[PDB]
């Protein structure tokens, strides 16, 4: 379709930004993981993680799955 | 942990931006879906969608799943 060329541009721009933000979030999450590890004790703040998941549910059920994936991106490289 | 207070702030800020970007992407994707529907013919550009998925694999295997979820967010509300 010729009339979707500019919509596709916008997608590509959005994806560039999403990827940068997700990468940064993975770095921050991993730093939080390293501080929690270093301190012994729970590897997650479960109440905190559940609240994040509930925020993402504003998007629908796919929103919960997104938060779940972002949670997995916070793991140490394994 | 007291030393993770500012890291948690950064997460919250990143999540605010991720959610706004994902919502916008869902709007654009749905507009592309509506143009494709209106035109009859394939509901997806499969080569295009596969290229998006491959870009997201730069993140790892979780990256492919992310692209997959974003693809589902582009559906008409159902």
Numbering used by the authors:
A (entry chain D), B (entry chain D): 11 to 88
Article sentences:
In M. tuberculosis, CM (MtCM, a dimer encoded by Rv0948c, aroQδ) has evolved to transiently interact with DS (MtDS, a tetramer encoded by Rv2178c, aroG) to form a heterooctameric complex. MtCM represents the structurally simple AroQδ subclass of CMs composed of two intertwined three-helix subunits. Only the complexed, but not the free dimeric MtCM, is responsive to feedback regulation by Phe and Tyr.
To elucidate the structural basis for the boost in catalytic activity, we solved the crystal structure of the top variant N-s4.15 to 1.5 Å resolution. In N-s4.15, this loop adopts a similar conformation as in EcCM, *MtCM, and MtDS-complexed MtCM that is distinct from the loop conformation in free MtCM. The activated loop is highly kinked, either because of Pro52 in the evolved variant or induced by binding to MtDS. However, in the variant N-s4.15, the C-terminal residues are less well-ordered compared with MtDS-activated WT MtCM (average B-factors of Pro87 and Asp88 are >100 Å2), and beyond residue 88, hardly any electron density is visible, suggesting that the C terminus is flexible in solution. Whereas the guanidinium group of Arg46 in the evolved N-s4.15 is still not in an ideal position but is pulled toward the newly introduced acidic residue Asp55, it is more similar to that of MtDS-activated MtCM compared with native uncomplexed MtCM.
